[PDB]
Amino acid sequence: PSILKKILLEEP
Amino acid sequence: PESADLRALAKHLYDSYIKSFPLTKAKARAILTGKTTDKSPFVIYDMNSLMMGEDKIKFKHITPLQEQSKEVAIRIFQGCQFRSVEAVQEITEYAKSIPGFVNLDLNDQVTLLKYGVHEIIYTMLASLMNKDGVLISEGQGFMTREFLKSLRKPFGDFMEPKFEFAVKFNALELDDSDLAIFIAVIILSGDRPGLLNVKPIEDIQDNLLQALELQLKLNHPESSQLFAKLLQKMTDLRQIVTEHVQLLQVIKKTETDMSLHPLLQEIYKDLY
Ligand SMILES: CN(CCOc1ccc(C[C@@H]2SC(=O)NC2=O)cc1)c1ccccn1
Known part of the structure; x- marks a missing residue:
């Protein structure tokens, strides 16, 4: 549910 | 000494900033004044020009037109929303470039962004503003302060506090x-509500603060208490995000026709 968490986890 | 390390940190952050944010203040100031010699943003000063230059691009950005049936005020307000959505991602990319950030507990990373993104958005919004208006769509447009203020209540004044902050x-x-x-310092704020491990965050911020101080002393030699003044702006940005959260409540009291983007819903949730 946390979109921020997903964006934080993606390979830069 | 460690001063050299502080300059290396400052440079690293600058390079990451250049990589994360398409429209820099340098490029924005050129447009707002003169040197574009190629730009010439479309000026939106009233309802007629708004229609005329509703970004004009046939529409290549994601999410076509049909946003219609909704009045001007709502469309502009939603446009600001999607801008923020884009900005949150640029800022997240930037935060992940700050030494030590990705090693922090993931939940604290979420919390730092949750409470830090709008403060950064308004800081960078100032880079695109002058006393008469603000650049939109990476400088392809320019909306006047007067126009934004003419918007019907309670939309006619969501931008006013930002312009006031920007001028100063x-x-x-x-x-x-x-x-x-400055932006890195804001992100690494150890006083955000709900942080699990405050110490590691403060350690990183203390270093960023030393780097900011040295940067200001070398880059603004004759600026008395710039560092002190800047820290104060930190607290002011805090007030804007809360002042905005309010207007956002007065808005959901009349228009059940608004709807907030999922990412903004998440960020605003139990914010303030
Ligand atoms: C007037 N402009 C300049 C952008 O100005 C901004 C003003 C406020 C924000 C914060 C958003 S607004 C909200 O309610 N929640 C948010 O996160 C972000 C950007 C427009 C207008 C239409 C389309 C694009 N640009």
């Missing part, structure tokens, strides 16, 4: 190299 903030004349560190 821009008077400090910070450049992109200064802003890169």
Whole structure:
């Protein structure tokens, strides 16, 4: 549910 | 000494900032004044020009037109929303470039962004503003302060506090190299609500603060208490995000026709 968490986890 | 390391940190942050944010303050100031020699943003000063230059691009950005049936005020407000959505992602990319950030507990990373993104958005919004208006769509447009203020209640004044902040903030004349560190300091705030491990965050911020101080001393030699003044702006940005959260409540009291983007819903949730 946390979109921020997903964006934080993606390979830069 | 460690001063050299502080300059290396400042440079690293600047380079990451350049990589993360398409429209720099340097490029924005050129447009707002003169040197574009290629730009010439479309000016939106009233309802007629708004229609005329509703970004004009046939529409290549994601999410086509049909946003219609909704009045001007709502469309502009939603446009600001999607801008923020884009900005949150640029800022997240930037935060992940700050030494030590990705090693923090993931939940604290979420919390730092949750409470830090709007403060950064309004800081960078100032880079695109002058006393008469603000640049939109990476400088392809320019909306006047007067126009935004003419919007029907309660939309006619969501931008006013930002312009007021911007005028005073821009008077400090910070450049992109200064802003890169300033923004990093804001993100690494150990006093955000709900943080699990405050110490590691403060350690990183203390270093960023030393780097900011040295940057200001070298880059603004004759600016008395710039560092002190800047820290104060930190607290002011805090007030804007809360002042905005309010207007956002008065808005959901009349228009059940608004709907907030999922990412903004998440960020605003139990914010303030
Ligand atoms: C007037 N402009 C300049 C952008 O100005 C901004 C003003 C406020 C924000 C914060 C958003 S607004 C909200 O309610 N929640 C948010 O996160 C972000 C940007 C427009 C207008 C239409 C389309 C694009 N640009």
